[PDB]
């Protein structure tokens, strides 16, 4: 948690002095941490989106209507 916090606070500074975005290398410099750790924290970072979320801008599909199930094998493959 604490580490996440640090991240975003510094993010503002960095964005404002670079002019745009901090690349993982550049961010990792200022943190005094390893680049792959920062990269993997970014990956773990993002939280779940709702399954009922209207993905269709028109309340057309609720995410579930896209959903493929990898567990069920086809009747073809059963044969």
């Amino acid at each position: 948690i604490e580490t996440i916090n640090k991240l975003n606070r510094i993010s503002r500074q960095m964005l404002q002095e670079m002019g745009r975005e901090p690349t993982p290398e550049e961010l990792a410099e200022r943190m005094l941490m390893p680049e792959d750790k920062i990269r993997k924290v970014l990956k773990i970072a993002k939280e779940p989106i709702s399954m009922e979320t209207p993905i269709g801008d028109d309340e057309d599909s609720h995410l579930g209507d896209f959903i493929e199930d990898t567990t069920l094998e086809l009747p073809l493959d059963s044969a």
């Binding site: 002019g19 990269r39 959903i67 069920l72 009747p75 059963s78």
Partner: protein, 1341 residues
């Protein structure tokens, strides 16, 4: 002397009226309104300026520190357009703002003399608009469509009938401010006036005034009519106003000082009123019989003791009158409530309202609004005042304020933000009037009542939203640390600002994918206007009200452009010539008619102004630059239409085409086409795909040039001059000395977009039209865009169409065509599909891009290189792999069977899933361009390397050539400056090109010109090196991608799209059809000449659907080609130019009262012969909308093209050889291949992916989904007696896993049985009922 491209091709105009004023830039709305938001105008409260001064200067809570706004600056865009498209980013510029942190003293009174730190703080990146009026959001083109909405201000609506059996006329005033809560004042059936604050619940309007500090008496004053009643001796006298007793029957005996006037009882006429009026009547002697039933004004106490004898606004009784006058008070104040003109309204509200003082009024406010909160006085005061009179929460805007001023007829247009107290009372005033039948109601659909919100205004809105949240945060931080140590740059945040902005552009419904199928769709789409979106109506929100057509749409919105079904009535196209005033009201241009005479003065009028004046029709007949033809002319006014005289005539329609938008204007024979089909026609045009071989419309409107030019898909000359070098990549032009600036170089640069992919997959390729060394001037069309001919919109192609029945092939608007269409490659379209493959890293393993693929044929491996990348330019098929990717396979326990198997052959099966990006099923073709996205950390693959080196190759070439040819024009002018005074050619030429640093002669205004171009070489060395550096930096630099993503490969694949059976095609008249069969040339019926037919449309698809324009087009279309092929014949026979000139000029001047008088003669032979060549395959004609080519002119043309006058010819069947029993209609129709391709719309599915929860197949060929068998569909089955079909649908074909698997097995083995089970959807349902706490179960039988 016409312009040089027109000499290359003119199209003939049959219009009788000469349109005076010019074609405006059509997408000005977009350009100009976006420019509003940026506008660096000092006093103008617009965009940035407006928002900043509203927020700033923001002072600290303590009143000591403050942040002040000075000025802003926009960084020049950090990354270019194409790059944004490629890398999936939004195209945006950095904003910085000069803020001054200013610190006042506690100690010194207001000594602005503590600290000033002044600096530029970064406020984030702001999405920029493209040149064409579009936006670049997350790598894709959207447009923000202009928005209609009901303007802030005041509306007075009527409930017509509505509720009640009575049909009680219930009027109401609706107050809508720009920013803030709303007020509703509506009439009870019982005539009582109720308010709804924020339209919540109804209570008495009177109590509002109580809160405003007004007591009962002041209220009754400002609304109802005062009447003074004096008590003297023993008789009652009143101060009487003459006009008060008008139209009343009679009770008592009026005497006027002396003489009698009015008979007791007999109804007084108007004459008796003036008699008495001029008699100076100050005090008429009334009986007190009247006052029995009137009512009291103020609260009269008895001064002598001070006891409350009688209170305000009470019923009148005899006994208290006596006690009252005994209190010594002999001057009281009756009310005038006589029904009819001034009914008992406000008085009645007062009675029912048990609420008392300002206190219980404030508490009653608070109670309805926050039920369950204590009557703390502070809460009440704070609530009410801050509801309507607070600066930050309540803003009418100039817009709201000005329109409010229009309803009330207020003096000044200029408004302060808050509702003044006086505003409120005014509302109600007008309300009473109306209830009597004094006032008139406001129309919900009036044009002046709806405003249009262009992009600038809406941008400003959402920027002010980001700024509001900014204010909460910033003001909180202004009390944060110490006033000494902190910096404003650290305290000021971008997040909520840029978040709100990217939500407007990206997530808004108003920011939508544009149609780029053709320039038309683009152009039109940008100027479409929707009444929907934020602050506007939804679909359910729309009844009959707004969907229906208002007559005031005339000249402002095209009445026939709009999507059918749900969207109809909501979204319409802006008509041609209409444009927005500063306040966002639509104005239409009209010609002034100064008392009978028609001037050249153009006046733009708003809707409400338009209603007032009398306008003549565009078609009305005029006399030579003066007056009218007709004594009684055809005119409109007050919304109505009829016949009117010259003297009242104030204005007139500017041109015919001013009624309609862009799409509809192209339709030539629009006058003869019913609106059902007209509508669809304009829609269809938007869906037409350009073929590679774009053809100009032979049947046009003159319109086709302006459309194409404004779309900006073509390349146009900025200065013109002479074309020095033309490439199918770049065109360089040397400008004429007239337009050329002497300091800079005069070599103009046009980079050409070649074979580029649009949003809808359609091709945009720009080909050069003119010839090298030709002269053109400003605004001539150099390169054609995709669906464009030499400047003309070339949306489609025109073919030989015979109207006639075929052996059931042209059945119900079905369409029959010749093999020749395929043969000639007309209606073949190029489609680019862009496809990606992503290399990410899971904790399961980093995926790699390599050519390493377990267990595939080396045949497929072959197209891949060392890195796993396709060789560029290979032709690929369905199933073939483009890009190699490998993925860590998870754990799989193989059945002992497979272990055995694996042991046996020992095949090297490593835990790896084949991730490589496969080619589409049923789509194939050549890859053009592949792209690499290297992440920074891990180094690039060999292919990545090689490809970024190819980028180097190209980049370098271009800049170098840019530099060198610039010198050629520069050193060309310096030699042209060096040869004037001292004529020394030879020596200079042979003396070295780079040594001209040493050259220099005399000094005056000419050495001033030498050193100018001389310091142009010295800045090219410096500038060009920085140029080179810029390009180098961005290719190599590590692409900031999504976290977790190692690398990417997008690939553009070409598709050669052939017309085939089942494709969709239409003409301009809304007549549409699917292609049923392509017949060999032999089947095709043929002419007398032996020319075989191209397309056969069924005639019976015409008359009942009512597009007659396509028939007219047919005939005109034939006529055009007649002139063209007669020209070809005389051309093949050489002959002489003179005869050709004579015929073709007489041809131009063919039209009845045709405007265009081209007395040719002066034109040089080259221009003439060149022109004839272009018209060898048909003269391009213009019937403009509502003033084009009528029937007569058409027939004349057919005879000079050597045609039978009917335009029906006798036709021979290619099958049998026999003549048809009667002549048939043939001719050219200009048609199109629509975006809907059966190629895609074919969807094959037996079995494939299922949904997660219900376990039903997903939807669409997108994920190989199954079609839904719906409620309705079910019903079909049920109609029949088919149980097991049903059951198949319900079970084996849907959510029954057991059933479909085992039935598959049995089908393969030769069984065909069901073997039934249970739909898992139902299992789902059961357990879901059980989670609700409801018992659901199977009763065992």
């Amino acid at each position: 002397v016409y312009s040089y491209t027109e000499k290359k091709r003119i199209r003939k105009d049959f219009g009788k009226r000469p349109q005076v004023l010019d074609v405006p830039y059509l997408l000005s709305i977009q350009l100009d309104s976006f420019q509003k938001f940026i506008e660096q105008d000092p006093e103008g409260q617009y965009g940035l300026e407006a928002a900043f001064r509203s927020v700033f200067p923001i002072q600290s809570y303590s009143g000591n520190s403050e942040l002040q706004y000075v000025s802003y600056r926009l960084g020049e865009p950090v990354f270019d357009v194409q790059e944004c498209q490629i890398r999936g980013v939004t195209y945006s510029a950095p904003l910085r703002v000069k803020l001054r942190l200013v610190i006042y003293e506690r100690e010194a009174p207001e000594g602005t003399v503590k600290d000033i730190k002044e600096q530029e703080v970064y406020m984030g990146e702001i999405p920029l608009m493209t040149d064409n009026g579009t936006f670049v959001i997350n790598g894709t083109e959207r447009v923000i469509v202009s928005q209609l909405h009901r303007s802030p201000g005041v509306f007075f609506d009527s409930d017509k009938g509505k509720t009640h059996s009575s049909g009680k006329v219930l009027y109401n005033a609706r107050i809508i401010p720009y920013r803030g809560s709303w007020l509703d004042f509506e009439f009870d059936p019982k005539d009582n006036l109720f308010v709804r604050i924020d339209r919540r619940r109804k209570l008495p309007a009177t109590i509002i005034l109580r809160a405003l500090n007004y007591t009962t008496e002041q209220i009754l004053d400002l609304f109802f009519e005062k009447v003074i009643f004096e008590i003297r001796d023993n008789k009652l006298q009143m101060e009487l106003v003459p006009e008060r007793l008008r139209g009343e029957t009679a009770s008592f005996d009026i005497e006027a000082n002396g003489k009698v006037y009015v008979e007791k009882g007999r109804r007084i006429t108007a004459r008796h009123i003036r008699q008495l009026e001029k008699d100076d009547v100050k005090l008429i002697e009334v009986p007190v019989e009247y006052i029995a039933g009137k009512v009291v004004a103020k609260d009269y106490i008895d001064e002598s003791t001070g006891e409350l004898i009688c209170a305000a606004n009470m019923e009148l009784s005899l006994d208290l009158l006596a006690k009252l006058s005994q209190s010594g008070h002999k001057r009281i104040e009756t009310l005038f409530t006589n029904d009819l003109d001034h009914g008992p309204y406000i008085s009645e509200t007062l009675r029912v309202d048990p609420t008392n003082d300002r206190l219980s009024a404030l508490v009653e406010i608070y109670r309805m609004m926050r039920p369950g909160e204590p009557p703390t006085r502070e809460a009440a005061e704070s609530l009410f005042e801050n509801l309507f009179f607070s600066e930050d929460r309540y803003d009418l805007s100039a817009v709201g304020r000005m329109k409010f001023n229009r309803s009330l007829l207020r003096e000044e247009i200029e408004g302060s933000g808050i509702l003044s107290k006086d505003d409120i009372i005014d509302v109600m005033k007008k309300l009473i009037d109306i209830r009597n039948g004094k006032g008139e109601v406001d129309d919900i659909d009036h044009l002046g009542n709806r405003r249009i919100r262009s992009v600038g205004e809406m941008a400003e809105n959402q920027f002010r939203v980001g700024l509001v949240r900014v204010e909460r945060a910033v003001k909180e931080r202004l009390s944060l640390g110490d006033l000494d140590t902190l910096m404003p740059q650290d305290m000021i945040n971008a997040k909520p600002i840029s978040a709100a902005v990217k939500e407007f552009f990206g997530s808004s419904q108003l920011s939508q994918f544009m149609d780029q199928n053709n320039p038309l769709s683009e152009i039109t789409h940008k100027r479409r206007i929707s009444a929907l979106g934020p602050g506007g109506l939804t679909r359910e929100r729309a009844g009959f009200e707004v969907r229906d057509v208002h007559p005031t749409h005339y000249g402002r919105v095209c009445p026939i452009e709009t999507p059918e079904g749900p969207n109809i009535g909501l979204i319409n196209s802006l008509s041609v010539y209409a444009q927005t005033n500063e306040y966002g009201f639509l104005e239409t241009p009209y010609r002034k008619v100064t008392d009978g005479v028609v001037t050249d003065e153009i006046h733009y009028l708003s809707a409400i102004e338009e209603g007032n004046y009398v306008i003549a029709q565009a078609n009305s007949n005029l006399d030579e630059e003066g007056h009218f033809v007709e004594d009684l002319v055809t005119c409109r006014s007050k919304g109505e239409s009829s016949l009117f005289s010259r003297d009242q005539v104030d204005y007139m329609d500017v041109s015919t085409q001013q009624v309609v938008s862009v799409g509809a204007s192209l339709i030539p024979f629009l006058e003869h086409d019913d609106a059902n089909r007209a509508l669809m026609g304009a829609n269809m045009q938007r869906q037409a795909v350009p073929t590679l071989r774009a053809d100009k419309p032979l049947v046009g409107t003159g319109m086709e040039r302006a459309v194409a030019v404004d779309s900006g898909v073509t390349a146009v000359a900025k200065r013109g001059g002479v074309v020095q070098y033309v490439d199918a990549s770049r065109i360089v032009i040397k400008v004429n000395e007239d337009e050329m600036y002497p300091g800079e170089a005069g070599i103009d640069i046009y980079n050409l977009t070649k074979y580029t992919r649009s949003n809808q997959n359609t091709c945009i390729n720009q080909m050069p039209c003119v010839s090298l060394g030709e002269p053109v001037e400003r605004g001539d069309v150099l390169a054609d865009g995709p669906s464009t001919d030499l400047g003309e919109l070339a949306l489609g192609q025109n073919m030989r169409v015979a109207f006639m029945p075929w052996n059931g092939y042209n059945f119900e608007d079905s369409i029959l065509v010749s093999e020749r269409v395929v043969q000639e490659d007309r209606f073949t379209t190029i489609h680019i599909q862009e496809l990606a493959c992503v290399s990410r890293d899971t904790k399961l393993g980093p995926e790699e891009i390599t050519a390493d693929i377990p267990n595939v044929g080396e045949a497929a491996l072959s197209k891949l290189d060392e890195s796993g990348i396709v060789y560029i330019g290979a032709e690929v098929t369905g199933g073939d792999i483009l890009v190699g990717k490998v993925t860590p396979k998870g754990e799989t326990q193989l059945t002992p069977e497979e272990k055995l198997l694996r042991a046996i052959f020992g095949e090297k099966a490593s835990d790896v899933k084949d991730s490589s990006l496969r080619v589409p099923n049923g789509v194939s073709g050549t890859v053009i361009d592949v792209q690499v996205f290297t992440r920074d950390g891990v180094e690039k693959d060999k292919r990545a390397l090689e490809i970024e080196e190819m980028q180097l190759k190209q980049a370098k070439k271009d800049l170098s050539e840019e530099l060198q040819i610039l010198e050629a024009g520069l050193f060309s002018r310096i030699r042209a400056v060096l040869v004037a005074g001292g004529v020394e050619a030879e020596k200079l030429d042979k003396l070295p090109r780079d040594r001209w640093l040493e050259l220099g002669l005399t000094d005056e205004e000419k050495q001033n010109q030498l050193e100018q171009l001389a310091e142009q070489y010295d800045e090219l060395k410096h500038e060009f090196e920085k140029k080179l550096e810029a390009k180098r930096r961005k290719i190599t630099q590590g692409d900031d991608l999504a976290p977790g993503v190692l690398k990417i490969v997008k690939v553009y694949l070409a598709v050669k799209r052939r017309i085939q059976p089942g494709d969709k095609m239409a003409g301009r008249h809304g007549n549409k059809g699917v292609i049923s069969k392509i017949n060999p040339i032999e089947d095709m019926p043929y002419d007398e000449n032996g020319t075989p037919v191209d397309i056969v449309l069924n005639p019976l698809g015409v008359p009942s659907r009512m597009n007659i324009g396509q028939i007219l087009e047919t005939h005109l279309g034939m006529a055009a080609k007649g002139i063209g092929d007669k020209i070809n014949a005389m051309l093949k026979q050489q002959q002489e130019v003179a005869k050709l000139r004579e015929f073709i000029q007489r041809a131009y001047d063919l039209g009845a009262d045709v405007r265009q008088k081209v007395d040719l003669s002066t034109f040089s032979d080259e221009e003439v012969m060149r022109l004839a060549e272009n018209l060898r395959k048909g003269m391009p004609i213009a019937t403009p909308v509502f003033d084009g080519a009528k029937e007569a002119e058409i027939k004349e043309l057919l005879k000079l093209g050597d045609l039978p006058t009917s335009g029906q010819i006798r036709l021979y069947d290619g099958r049998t050889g026999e003549q048809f029993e009667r002549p048939v209609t043939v001719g050219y129709m200009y048609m199109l291949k629509l975006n809907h391709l059966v190629d895609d719309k074919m969807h094959a599915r037996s079995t494939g992916s299922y949904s997660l929860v219900t376990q039903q197949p997903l939807g669409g060929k997108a994920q190989f989904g199954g079609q839904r068998f719906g409620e309705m569909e079910v019903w079909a089955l049920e109609a029949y007696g088919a149980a097991y079909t049903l059951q198949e649908m319900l079970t084996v074909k849907s959510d029954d896993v057991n059933g479909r698997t085992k039935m598959y097995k049995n089908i393969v083995d030769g069984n065909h049985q069901m073997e039934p089970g249970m739909p898992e959807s139902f299992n789902v349902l059961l357990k879901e009922i059980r989670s609700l706490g409801i018992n659901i179960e199977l009763e065992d039988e």
